[model samples]
Target: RMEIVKIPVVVHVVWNEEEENISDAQIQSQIDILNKDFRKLNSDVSQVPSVWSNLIADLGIEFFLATKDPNGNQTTGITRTQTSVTFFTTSDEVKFASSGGEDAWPADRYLNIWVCHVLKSEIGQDILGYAQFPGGPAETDGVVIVDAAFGTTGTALPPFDKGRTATHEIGHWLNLYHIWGDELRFEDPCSRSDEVDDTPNQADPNFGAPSYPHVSCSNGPNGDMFMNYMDYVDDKCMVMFTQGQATRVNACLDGPRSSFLA
Candidate 1:
C-alpha cells in the first residue's frame, strides 16, 4: 500500500494589473480544481477512454493553498505581484523569473507553480505549459503555465478548462517525461524513454486531442496512449494517469525531491 503525500503548494500570480489579472477567487478556484483532479474526484472521471479505464491510477496526492509563508505567517496560500515589466506575458518570458532573482521553490518544501500570461509561439506550435525536471538546472525545477492555460477560471475554457495541463506538467516535476520522449521519430533514434512501462511504445509525440482510437508506430490494441495525462492533449480530453506513471511519481517523491512534503 502506498501512503498518500500532501504536497504544499504556493500559487504565484505574476501579471500586469491593467491586463487580465486573476482575482483571489480565481486562484482559489484553480486550487479547488487541483485537489479534485489529483484525488480522482473530477466529474469527468467516467469520460476516460474505455480501453485505458482500468489503468486509471488515483494519484494519492493533495495540494493546498499555502496558508502560511515559509516563515510561518498567516496567509491565504496564494501570492500576487504586479509587474510593470512586460516579460512574463508569453512563453519565452517564463524562461526567467519575472522578478529577476531565483525562479524556483525552496527545493526542500512546497511546489511552486507560476501562473502568468505568456506569449504564444507560431501557429500550430503550442507551448501552453512546461515543467522542469528534478535534476534539471537548479533554478528551473518548477512548472510554468499561461494564466489562461492554467486552472479552471478567468479566460480558461473548453479544451483547457479541465486543468489537466497542471496535472501533466506536475507529472514532469515528479519525473515523468513525454511518452514519445519529446523528440521527432526520424531525428533521435535512441533518446531515453519517458521511463515508464505502461505508456506503450510510442514513436513520437501526439499533439492536441487525437481521436480516441488513433494508431501509430505499430502500437496496437488501442494504438498510442494519446489520452494519457503525459501527452499534449486538450484538458477535458485527458483523464487518467497510467499505473506505470503512478510508480514513477512515487519514486520521485521518495528520491531527490522527498523533502518537498516532509
Candidate 2:
C-alpha cells in the first residue's frame, strides 16, 4: 500500500508594486487550500453531482510551506523579490533573477510557486495562472499564479479568489491534463484524451457556473464533470478530483517527480 506523500513548497512572491506584494496570511491561505483539496477535505466536495460521487478521490498527499531554506538556514518558505517588470507572461521571465524575478529553489526538493501580476491572456481574459508540467527544465519549474488569484484573502479577486487557480495549475504540475484534454475548441470534441480513464469525455470546458447535467460529446445522463478541478469553471464551481486522477498523480510521484515523495 502507498503511504501518504508529503511535499514541501516554496512560494516566491515576485512583485512590482505595493498591492502585488501579497500578505503572508494570503500566501498561507493558498497553502491551506492545497492541503485541504489534495486530501479531499474541501467542504465543497459535498456539492459534487450525485451520479459521480463515487469518483471523489482522496489524493493521500499533503503540502506544507518549507521550514528550512536550501542552505540549511531557518526560513519561512516564502521569498520576496521586488522587480521592475510590472507584469509577466507565460514566457517565464518571472523565473529568473536577471529578469527582475527571484530564482527558483531546487525543483526536485521543493515545489516552487511564483506569485505575481500576469499579463492579460491572448483570449482577452486576464491570465490567472499556469504551470510547468513534470520533466521540464529545473530552472523554470513549478507553478506561477496571478496575485489576485493566489489566495482567499488580501488581493484575492472576485470569481477567481478562493485559491483554485493554483489547485488547477498544480493539477497540471502533477501531470494531469485539463478535463477536456486541452481541446478548448469544441470542433474536435471527443478526439483528445486527458490520458485519465474515468473522467467523462467532455467536448469543451465549462465556464462561469454552468448548471448540472450540462451535456456534450453525447455524454448525457450524468453529463460533464464540470465541477472537477481540471475544468475551467470558477473557483466555487469546481470541486473534486477523481480516483483516476489521483492514480495519475501517484504515477507522477512515482516517476518524474519522485524527489517529492516522502
Candidate 3:
C-alpha cells in the first residue's frame, strides 16, 4: 500500500474582473475535491463502468494550502493580484509579477497555482487549463487555470464545474502524459501509449461522455478508458487513475520531484 504524502499548495488569484477573484469557500471546495479524488474516496459505481472499478487507485496524496509564507510569516496560502492582461499562456510572463502576474512562491517547496482569465487556443477551443511538466524552469514551474473553469463554484463553468480540470493539469505537473498523448503524431496513436500499461491502448481522446466499450485502435470489448482523469472527457465523466499510472507517479515522486518526498 502507498503511504500518505502531503503537498503544500499556494493559490495565486490574478483577476481582471471583480468576479475573477474567487471566494475562500470555492477554493476550499476545489481542494476538498482534490483530497477526495486523489485518495480514491469519491466513488459512484453507477457512473463508472464496472470494468474500471478494480483499476481505481488511491494515490495516498493529500494537499493543503501553506499556512506560512517563505518569509516566516502567517499567510492564507492564497495571493490575490490584479492583472491588466487578458490571456495567459503556460509561459514565464504569467509567472512574473513584473508582467502583470504574480511571481511564483518557490516551486520546489510549494505547488503554485495561478488562476486568471485566459482565451482558448487559436481555433476557438476551450483551453480550460495547463500545467508545466517536472523538467521545466523553476520560475515557470506550476499550473495555470482559466478562472472560468476553476473550482466547483464562483466563476466555474458548466460541464467543467466539478473541479476536475485542476486534477488533470496536476497529473501533467507530476509528469503524467495525456491518455491519448498529443496529436500531430496523429499518424499513429495506439503505437504511442501514455506509457502506463494498464490504461489500455487508445486511439484518441473521448469528448463529453462516451459509452463504455467504445472501441478504437483494436481495443475491443473495453475500448478507451475514457473514465481516466488523463483523458479529455468531461469533468463529471472522469473518475480514476490506473495502478500503472500510480507506479509512474511514484517514479516521478522518487525521481524528478524527490524534494517533495518528505
- By summed lDDT, which 10 consecutive residues of candidate 3 come out lowest? 43-52
Candidate 1 vs candidate 2: which has greater TM-score?
A: 2
Local lDDT at 73 for model 1: 83
lDDT of 1 by residue, 102-213 (tens): 2555656777787776544545344667777887555555777767777677767667776778888888888888887766646653354778877777776666768867
Instruction: Judge candidate 2 against the unseen true structure and give its global Cα lDDT, from 0 to 1.
Output: 0.90
Please rank every candidate by TM-score, starting with the best.
2, 3, 1
The estimated TM-scores of all candidates read 0.86, 0.96, 0.95
How accurate locally is residue 256 in candidate 2, as Cα lDDT from 0 to 100?
Answer: 98
User: Which numbered prediction scores highest in lDDT against the true structure?
Assistant: 2
Residue 164 in model 1: lDDT: 78
Model 2 poorest ten-residue lDDT run: 117-126
TM-score of 2: 0.96
Q: Compared with the true structure, what per-residue lDDT tens digits does model 3 show for residues 1-262?
A: 5778788899999988888888998888788888988888876424667877788888888999999897878999999999888777644467899999999988888899988888455565758888889985888888888877788888888899888999999998888899986756537766676888888888888999898778988878878889889999888988887788889888888888888878
Question: What is the C-alpha lDDT profile of model 2 across 89-148, one tens digit per residue?
Answer: 788888999988889999999999999886555465668888899987999999999998
Q: Is candidate 2 or candidate 3 better by TM-score?
A: 2
Clash number for every model?
A: 7, 0, 0
Model 2 has how many clashing residue pairs? 0
Give the clashing pairs for model 1.
66-77, 89-117, 89-118, 89-119, 90-118, 90-119, 91-119
User: Candidate 2: deviation at residue 19, Å?
Assistant: 1.3
Which lDDT values do the candidates have, in the order given?
0.71, 0.90, 0.84
